Design a protein around this ligand. Structure first.
Ligand SMILES: [Mg+2]
Ligand SMILES: [Mg+2]
Lengths: 417, 415
């Protein structure tokens, strides 16, 4: 290609774990840095460094993302019991996404990456669906415990001004059990709502906020109340103007509608439902690998693009020994592209935005032309009916095909001006 | 059946609301009692009577279910803001299904009804899938509240044996917000697990418990642990004998893995997940109306077979104005059959069991042959390519067709 595109402001990079960390490197080397001059603020969120720093690098990386307004994040391991044994960890550390999302706040938007030849497990979904997952609070900022004896679990609220304290007896445990408490601010639900309406306007689509307000009257009612209050006060005229609507729905009614519908709408979820229902969407549209994830913070400027799927552990065992693999890198690629795309919007850099979009176009077209990794070929032909270099190809070979197609596609650009 | 089938012990009947209430008494009058002599213990759980009794009749029906060990429940209204204006209720009463499940406890087993002519929205699922929803606790017995000003929200556990009281600060509120707290006992999780393992063995299918124990390490971890403890102590040897397995899984891995698979397993969900994921299975397998729902208590004897779908109001307004409707009653019929089928198995009554099966086989065959309601027609032809008395029948007509086919099927049996 020509001279590299000069990016004025920096971009935070959060490095990942095991096999997603290796393809992360090959993406920077072959696709990003050859075409883009960018100042990269590095943070290693790999599990070894998190252990060494005591999960402090996770906090510092989030604070850096607040400062420079853009981050890109590779996939990381949230450690279980076996991982503490393997990595010799001093503590079973909490989810780094949880720590970051709590600090930044806002709304995780998730939508599928549409490859026209990839078959859908849900034939009904002709148009694409976007989830707006609430990034803060609920189960991901909870306080849970085990009860080993008889006792009285209660909630207590002590006002700051000094008026008398309120109390609620949750349960008198007769013997052993478990208990937990969670929360959410009005502020975070407001910023969550603003994000979902504004995205619903920009997309020219309707919005649906699912809750379970019939059971949790005070808690889930506050979601429905704040959404309806903001809709009718700010975006009522704009939805009517654009031939679209906002509605609430019951969560168990909603998941039936979605599976039955043709699609083509925004779907606002609470924190927990966003996690569960977005992995249904992804898999229904074709594959877990084909999905984006962009945490849009309430301030309007800040984002954290990231790899949707988890780390590929079994494929990492092969790369240690020096053997080939076939791991789909497209999620990691799109995390980079959406990071640069938003970097460009913030600075008015038109070349950077068009580069990002061109790379997204290429990744799709490459798969559409029958060049793909094993997991995507398994969607088409069946998982045990595919040969090496015939139906699918290796991970670095697939990246080399994208590298090649990117240069070709960038060749058709500028030459016609 | 010139003489009816006698039933030694009683059955509890919980009457419902609006349109299902109408088709409930249709089923009682012309489908059940003509062929079965069964002493029913009537409890009206309609919303007007629940207001009359301060939701006490709801409790009374549960205590009756404990005594006689079988219940059948029509669909009821969980009232919202709009219902308190309409019915002029004194208080916005809580869910009667919530109140009953809390008192009885156990595992709500939900599985689809397979009609071969109905298409599935998930082509992958060749074989059927049974969810085992946990009946008790979690969000359904939660204390939740709104926060109007700044303050410190904390939890407190005060041991009864006089040991040290523990406290956890949850959050220090700057502005307003919301907070809640919930619980679950170890005994509830045991009976839940046992019920799931016994059903998984009797089906000869593998079991999968799903949790989010990476995040809620203590709470969801307790489920993972108790299931695994009970498996290895009691059931591992019988699972191995029938070529089946138990496995834990992460919830967001499970929902992907289920949709990808071709079914044929038992899926043990927690209380909240079972509510949501059962509607995905139902809708995906064909339609919300083609779903059974049987609460199976920890003791093994007691059950409560309920109507899965809600009491759809759209159609009830047409009925009140004289016009015909097209609601699917098959759910409500299966509530009866599964009640009677269990009533028969408890008492050793082979005739009652055969009858219950015959009616289920009739409901399926009736749809498979061609006769069906509007919503089941819409699954095949689409919702706006359907003709009244061509592609579908009325609610009244459909029930008379089932009554006819039941009588002819029963009339063929005696030979
Ligand atoms: Mg996930
Ligand atoms: Mg439900």
């Amino acid at each position: 290609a020509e001279k590299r595109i000069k990016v004025e402001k920096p971009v935070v990079e959060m490095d990942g774990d095991e096999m997603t960390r290796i393809i992360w490197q090959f993406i920077k080397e072959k696709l990003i840095l050859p075409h883009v001059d960018v100042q990269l603020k590095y943070f290693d969120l790999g599990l070894p460094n998190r252990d060494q720093t005591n999960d402090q690098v996770t906090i510092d990386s989030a604070l850096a993302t607040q400062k420079y307004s853009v981050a890109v994040k590779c996939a990381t391991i949230t450690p279980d019991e076996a991982r503490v044994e393997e990595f010799k960890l001093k503590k079973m550390w909490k989810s780094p996404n949880g720590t970051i999302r709590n600090i930044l706040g806002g709304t995780v938007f998730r939508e599928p990456i549409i490859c026209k030849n990839i078959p859908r497990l849900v034939p009904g979904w002709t148009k694409p669906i976007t989830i707006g997952r609430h990034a803060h609070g609920d189960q991901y900022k909870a306080t849970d415990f085990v009860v080993d004896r008889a006792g009285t679990f209660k909630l207590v609220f002590t006002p700051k001004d000094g008026s008398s304290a309120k109390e609620w007896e949750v349960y008198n445990f007769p013997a052993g059990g478990v208990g937990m408490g969670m929360y959410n601010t009005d502020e975070s639900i407001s910023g969550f709502a603003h994000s979902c309406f504004q995205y619903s306007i920009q997309k020219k689509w309707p919005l649906y906020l699912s809750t379970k307000n019939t059971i949790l009257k005070a808690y889930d009612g506050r979601f429905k109340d704040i959404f309806q209050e903001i809709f009718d006060k700010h975006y009522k005229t704009d939805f009517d103007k654009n031939k679209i609507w906002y509605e609430h729905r019951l969560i168990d009614d909603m998941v039936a509608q979605v599976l039955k519908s043709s699609g083509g709408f925004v779907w606002a979820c609470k924190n927990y439902d966003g996690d569960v229902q977005s992995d249904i969407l992804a898999q229904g549209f074709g594959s877990l690998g084909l999905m984006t994830s962009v945490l849009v913070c309430p301030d309007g400027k800040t984002i954290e693009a990231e790899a949707a799927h988890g780390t590929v552990t079994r494929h990492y065992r092969e790369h240690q020994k020096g053997r080939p693999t076939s791991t789909n890198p497209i999620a990691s690629i799109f995390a980079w592209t959406r990071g640069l795309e938003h970097r460009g919007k913030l600075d008015g850099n038109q070349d950077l935005i068009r580069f990002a979009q061109t790379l997204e176009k290429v990744c799709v077209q490459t798969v559409e032309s029958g060049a793909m990794t094993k997991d995507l070929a398994g969607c088409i032909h069946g998982l045990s009916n595919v040969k090496l270099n015939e139906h699918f190809l290796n991970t670095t070979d697939f990246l080399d095909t994208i590298k090649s197609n990117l240069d070709r596609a960038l060749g058709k650009q500028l030459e016609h001006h």
